[PDB]
Amino acid sequence: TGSLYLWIDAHQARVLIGFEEDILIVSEGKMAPFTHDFRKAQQRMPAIPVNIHSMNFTWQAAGQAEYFYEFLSLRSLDKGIMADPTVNVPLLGTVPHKASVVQVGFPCLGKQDGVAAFEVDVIVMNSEGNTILKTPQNAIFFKTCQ
Amino acid sequence: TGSLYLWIDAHQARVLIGFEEDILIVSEGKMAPFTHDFRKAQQRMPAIPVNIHSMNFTWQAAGQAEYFYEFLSLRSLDKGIMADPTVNVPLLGTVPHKASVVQVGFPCLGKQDGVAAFEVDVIVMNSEGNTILKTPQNAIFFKTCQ
């Protein structure tokens, strides 16, 4: 079975949706069932509130197999409202064996007000160079800036 | 300055060309000057002899920076003479900090006789996901099979 995990820790989840419980995105190298019908899932995703400037994701490659991630696109679609989203990790790297936090930042410029559309396109490859996991095609996320 | 190195060790070089001296291919992340005019370099490259079944390449990422390699193509163009070239490393991985040997195998089938054309297309990427080194475009190598 797969060894990859991606989740939002209970504390971060509490700050985001009010419920203090881990939000599983990938478990044992498999996308969580709520993400399969992605367009339906995006409707239950509100625009990231003004109080949140960054979000903590936790990931791990829990076994002996090596996995490589790559951020293909970190792009704001409303550059006048928010600058490009950021990550505190190199764009290309290894998924760590020890569970580690990736901080995704949403840099509202303050020179305007509104909701900024943005992309976080990431892929995970195995040691054969095959893409085994990735941000659903054409996924768009939103950040409320004031 | 760069930290990547790729070379053919003096012992392997002796077996291949008769001269016992390291053959530098990449030094400090830069392609060796003999490879710049690649078509001229390929003329000084004879078809790998019948006595050699595999070749040892030595590589290292000598610094703190992480580098990722990927074998994009390991392909025989004469499948009736030689099967696809092989490597004893995963197709996608990290360039090791400790100098390590990659064994490239040339599996002559023995069901025929002649010279087999083949490709070894490899890329090296930095932590930003940019290709910084790669097999020269359209490079072709040859293996004498009997």
Ligand SMILES: CCCCCCCCCCCCCCCC(=O)OC[C@H](COP(=O)([O-])OCC[N+](C)(C)C)OC(=O)CCCCCCCCCCCCCCC
């Ligand atoms: C560090 C990478 C972050 C890569 C992704 C970075 C995207 C950055 C955008 C952040 C926006 C996320 C929050 C959206 C606003 C919000 O409040 O949404 C809550 C959501 C949906 O969760 P929910 O509303 O709870 O839905 C029900 C699921 N239950 C309840 C059953 C657990 O909570 C979420 O589930 C958020 C999901 C965001 C990710 C969707 C898919 C990404 C898949 C990438 C796969 C490749 C990587 C695999 C790695 C092993």
Ligand SMILES: CCCCCCCCCCCCCCCC(=O)OC[C@H](COP(=O)([O-])OCC[N+](C)(C)C)OC(=O)CCCCCCCCCCCCCCC
């Ligand atoms: C493990 C990867 C092997 C990746 C490449 C695998 C290719 C497999 C094909 C093997 C065929 C190589 C032998 C050809 C037959 C032969 O006898 O050639 C000798 C050659 C040329 O060397 P020379 O004849 O000595 O030329 C003069 C150079 N002086 C003398 C100044 C040092 O000796 C050679 O220099 C061989 C050069 C073969 C490689 C050419 C370019 C590859 C660049 C890849 C860059 C990306 C990777 C960077 C990594 C940090």
Ligand SMILES: *[C@@H]1O[C@H](CO)[C@@H](O)[C@H](O)[C@H]1NC(C)=O
């Ligand atoms: C995000 O992680 C950082 C570093 O561990 C921590 O300082 C911060 O409190 C975390 N945020 C939330 C909302 O849990």
Ligand SMILES: *[C@@H]1O[C@H](CO)[C@@H](O)[C@H](O)[C@H]1NC(C)=O
């Ligand atoms: C290639 O490397 C292997 C493993 O270290 C060794 O057994 C073999 O003798 C080497 N070949 C040459 C020609 O040096």
